[PDB]
Write a protein that binds this ligand. Sequence first.
Ligand SMILES: CC(=O)N[C@H]1[C@H]([C@H](O)[C@H](O)CO)OC(C(=O)O)=C[C@@H]1O
Ligand SMILES: CC(=O)N[C@@H]1[C@@H](O)[C@H](O)[C@@H](CO)O[C@@H]1O
Ligand SMILES: CC(=O)N[C@@H]1[C@@H](O)[C@H](O)[C@@H](CO)O[C@@H]1O
Ligand SMILES: CC(=O)N[C@@H]1[C@@H](O)[C@H](O)[C@@H](CO)O[C@@H]1O
Lengths: 324, 324, 324, 160, 160, 160
Amino acid sequence: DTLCIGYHANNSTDTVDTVLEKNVTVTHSVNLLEDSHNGKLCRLGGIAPLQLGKCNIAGWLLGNPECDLLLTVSSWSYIVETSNSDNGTCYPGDFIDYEELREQLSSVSSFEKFEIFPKTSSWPNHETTRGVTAACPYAGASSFYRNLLWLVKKGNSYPKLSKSYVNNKGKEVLVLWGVHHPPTSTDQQSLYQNADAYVSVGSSKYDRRFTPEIAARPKVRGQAGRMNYYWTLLEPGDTITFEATGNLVAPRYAFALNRGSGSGIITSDAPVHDCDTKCQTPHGAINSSLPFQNIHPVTIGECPKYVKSTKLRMATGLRNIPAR
Amino acid sequence: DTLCIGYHANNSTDTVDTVLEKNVTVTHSVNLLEDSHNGKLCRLGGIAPLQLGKCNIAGWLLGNPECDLLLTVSSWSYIVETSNSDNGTCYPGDFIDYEELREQLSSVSSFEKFEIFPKTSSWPNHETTRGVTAACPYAGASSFYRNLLWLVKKGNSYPKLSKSYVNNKGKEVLVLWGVHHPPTSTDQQSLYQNADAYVSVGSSKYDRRFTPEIAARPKVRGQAGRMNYYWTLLEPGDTITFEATGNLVAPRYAFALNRGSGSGIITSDAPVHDCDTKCQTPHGAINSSLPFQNIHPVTIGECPKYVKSTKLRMATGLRNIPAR
Amino acid sequence: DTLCIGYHANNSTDTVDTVLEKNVTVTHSVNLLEDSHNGKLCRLGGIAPLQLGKCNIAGWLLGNPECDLLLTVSSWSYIVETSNSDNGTCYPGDFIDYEELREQLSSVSSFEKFEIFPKTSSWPNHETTRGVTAACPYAGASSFYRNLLWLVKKGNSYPKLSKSYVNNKGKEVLVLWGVHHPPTSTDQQSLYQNADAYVSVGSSKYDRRFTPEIAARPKVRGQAGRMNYYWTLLEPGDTITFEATGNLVAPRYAFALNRGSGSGIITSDAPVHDCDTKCQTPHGAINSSLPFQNIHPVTIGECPKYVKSTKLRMATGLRNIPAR
Amino acid sequence: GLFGAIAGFIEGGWTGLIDGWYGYHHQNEQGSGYAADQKSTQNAIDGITNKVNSVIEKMNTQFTAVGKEFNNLERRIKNLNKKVDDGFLDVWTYNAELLVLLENERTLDFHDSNVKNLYEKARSQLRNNAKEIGNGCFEFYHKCDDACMESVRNGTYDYP
Amino acid sequence: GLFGAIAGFIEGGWTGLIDGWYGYHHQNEQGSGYAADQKSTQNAIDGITNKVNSVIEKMNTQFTAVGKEFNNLERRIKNLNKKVDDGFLDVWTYNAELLVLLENERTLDFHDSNVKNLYEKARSQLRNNAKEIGNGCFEFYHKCDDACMESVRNGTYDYP
Amino acid sequence: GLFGAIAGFIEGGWTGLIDGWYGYHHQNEQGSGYAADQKSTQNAIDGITNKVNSVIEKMNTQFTAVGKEFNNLERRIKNLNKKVDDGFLDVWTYNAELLVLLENERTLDFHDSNVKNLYEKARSQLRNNAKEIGNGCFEFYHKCDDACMESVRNGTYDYP
Ligand SMILES: CC(=O)N[C@H]1[C@H]([C@H](O)[C@H](O)CO)OC(C(=O)O)=C[C@@H]1O
Ligand SMILES: CC(=O)N[C@@H]1[C@@H](O)[C@H](O)[C@@H](CO)O[C@@H]1O
Ligand SMILES: CC(=O)N[C@@H]1[C@@H](O)[C@H](O)[C@@H](CO)O[C@@H]1O
Ligand SMILES: CC(=O)N[C@@H]1[C@@H](O)[C@H](O)[C@@H](CO)O[C@@H]1O
């Protein structure tokens, strides 16, 4: 009689490498590298993502005439910009510390929009109905940002204005505004009467003064003039004061911000779908318990560690030697 | 007769982990992870840390009235700021490049303070006795920064002043100063006569001009005006020149800095103690030869590498099998 | 009759270390650490490096009088600054965002220098022959930057000048210019008549206004005045316009940049030789197939991974037991 | 093979064995067949299971990680930011692959070792009552019947 | 056990052995006892000591690492600085826990190997002048007194 | 060694052997000399060459890496940049030295295992036809001419 001692074998085709040998076929193994995604922008925590579509953060917050769709949105799980998010500042100019504002928004999960300075009632001594421009059209006609109010002189007179707002929202209030720079002194006097105007803005931590800089710049969107955009985060309980003798593109709407840890802004052209996920990438969502993924480095939620690897298979069984 | 071959076993309860098995009792092992400290801020190299207490760095260098306790300290092993280090700029305003200056102080181990512009001899043509405010009180009475000098008009006159210092200390000299901004044109005139004053500061590499920005901003510490603080490191042998027709909060004291990398600034609420250590953390001093520690990532002196591990035990002996 | 099983052994003195044992002599081993270089600066990609020598990037781009040797160079594989690269801005002032410019040059392989604003015909109403100074001497006499043009009033008149340039090159165009700041209002009028002058510069993306800051700064190279240098990269098709009523150190020569990526600026006193290489460090060229090198952290081209190791030898053969 | 068993003195594996990783064949008068050894197979399953689990543990989950924008005058920090992103990406790619590559090596050797020990165990268990043929087989002397073959398997046997 | 010795064919350890890690027991006509094999025990001590120090040599020392403050308009650099601190922290934490896990596996195998090798050394000396009883015990055929036992230990049992 | 062969029960190597890492000596009535065992030598040469290529493969070649300049008011980012550069240098220096140490240990044990398997192989062949002298030597009972010796080498021997 005879008794032999041997080891298992099967029809496995799995292969793994080692320092000494490569392509070693084994009997059992586990893949640790996730490479599948549903190619769709899903919602995290049950909340939908904010699709900016053809608009970007600038156009959205300032209220570019082409971003009216976003107007009703007040909460999101993450912000999405497409490769066509070109609608931002329609009136040429510099948006000061724009990248920082974007970084700020990355931790905001929602806000409460409110009319910080009501258009009808805040500016008794100034024109509030002529602040439109062909540079920011809407339905062919001249228009302007929905969240800013371009004020001009009233009856050939622009009195020193002074308006303040006390932040009683119990949270950070994002206030935006602009300072206009006409191309010529004739335009300056024609819009604000005063030749030597200035705009002042102050809070407990913010304090800056702006002077008009008249000069004809190469026309951008048919404008030789420029308009700079500013913002600040007024702290709970603080006060912000605007003083000007011209050139002020006053705040109309502001946002009380709700901080939400974990979130961000991404660029994707993938479609938003009636889907749910715990891990989202610009290419699509991931539903995996694997330690690694090689789909995308940018992630949102609970995701596998990203890595460049093409294969991450770990042998669990023994070398397979069926020998049939 | 018999002769067996066996291995050691004992009463050890030490356990380690391995790839294949966890919680393996062993005969001998060594803990590489240090998790103990004395919970005290001690001396390094026989030198005590600079305990800023209720004051922060700004309050320290400017000489806030509430930081007189620090006036005689000129060398330290490291600087300590607490959770309550709130006394800094008692008169509201922006402290220009403040973080950079803190970064600079991180490698300063001591200095020599000296009255760069003596108060009683440097300004014959300007008032030196009334630069006080309720915003910077002392003993209930209006006072001011100890290291700065608020100059005002003398008998309804503020002539153009010009002061220069040539650095002969043989090292870097930190010079601080300020520019005051009244809330009203009336205050501007009451303080400096000259409606359109200016301040100029220059060295071989420094060159800036300041203009008063008159405006009423929200009152902070009762003040509607603002005061901005500035600094620069005057190189050995170089010259700094101050020119002004108003609004200058002149330097009174300055510091000759001694570089000594290997120092730093920490935030701790732990108490200072008459004790010595080779390693210091914000939680307390470490005294060990182990390669790792999970006390704190911030360190000063000779210290074990900080790691997030809760346990790091290396087996040295063998699988302990007493089978008692 | 006998048969024995054994292993190889030779006269090798090669040693490698292991966890359990140090300095183990083995039969065969491979060194993975490269530690040799020719101590020379050779040419990469078949092109010689740009030897700035006595000059630094500022001197090279502005055209400092002591850098005329570089005037002919328009192509390079990498730039070399030496321990004596001091000829930069001869006239004292601030070079704005200098470090950023240097960073931009990183991927510039060559440029097409051109006279954006021809000196003999761009300024009909301004003096173009008196923009010299003793701070920028040449052959003992007073001179100035080769690439900039210091304009001054003509016949006691300095009209408002307006000059524009359209980037027609199909690539970025680096434009440099300066703003002069005289020490006294006397000099201000001697040079530009207009007491309230200003320099305005604008493109589709650039927009800034400069105002003279009259003040006597500590003399540098004999000057109490100051000159600030600015630059911008004009995009293909964009337009840049200069407007000034004084104080403008106009651009004369600009640079159409060509990208070639994978390069930079190194500091080295090593000598440049007629020689080629794939890997260049500040100490010298490397010719190796090894994976590591402890020569230098700064590298240009394809190089072995820099590491701080002194030795890195792998065992291929076995423990050498000659037992002779 | 590092322990000379698998792909060594016991060439090929048994596709017939389908209830474990390590087992015996057995060819008795009453019949033949296959039988895996729990003790071994199970013990290995645990270890290997602890191994994979250990690996997953060490690798950290990746939470929200989004990019940052920079203007045209922040090229230096933009590059710093990129240098940091690539730096950590390479370091972790290196760590993942290298650990797997090394654990795979150790795993096979582990199995190879397990077989070898199973043999050596049976070997000393029998000794005189059978001879070493090779390929991991023992040819008895006292015609080991079924109940006998089992005695060897369950470790009892214990026959002088 | 990777080598089948410790907790293998030599089921348990000896609390009675207190001179080294590996050793012999012996039950001669003159009396029993324990004795450690200084040769293999020391070589093990040297190796493990080297390992421990090699682990430490690698993991550098931390000198002075302090923070940086950032103003409300430097949120990106601030996050960049955090990404850098958290990144290296995780990396080093990984390196340290992993090295220890891997070296702990090696170390136990190292001991197992040494016990195994010791058994084979003793066995190769006694040859047929004694039989293998199992449990790593060698029953002698020819009476072996303490003087004899000692010779087996120092490997000079030089006797046909 | 982990397997007891090299520097173990086979005390030393053969400067004489010069056509392989593992070989045979053999002293037949006809003559003497040394003969390397291709099968093995080659195999080990493939595994080692593969291990070395793998190490090189994991390490990413360095491309253009230059310094960045910072003004006097950018000491924080300057230091951040330096922290990053120093951070990765220390990590990669750690990986390079550590990998080389771990593999060296493994390599020497690989060889030890190879010599051991070779012995056990030549041994499993000869069986009763010779005795184990030690030092890896087998003394033949039934004599063995150069034709017979070679027969053992290429594992064709056969003769229980
Ligand atoms: C130097 C000086 O005049 N100080 C006065 C100060 C100052 O006028 C104002 O803060 C500037 O706007 O006002 C009040 C105060 O308690 O602060 C009285 C001070 O004596
Ligand atoms: C005010 C505004 O921004 N409108 C323009 C719109 O007219 C134009 O078609 C679009 C192109 O993408 O850019 C902007 O949206
Ligand atoms: C000069 C100065 O700063 N004094 C204030 C003091 O009035 C205030 O009560 C305290 C509260 O933190 O802060 C500072 O000490
Ligand atoms: C033209 C100029 O810049 N002046 C001098 C230059 O002549 C000299 O060669 C150099 C060396 O330090 O210093 C300055 O650059």
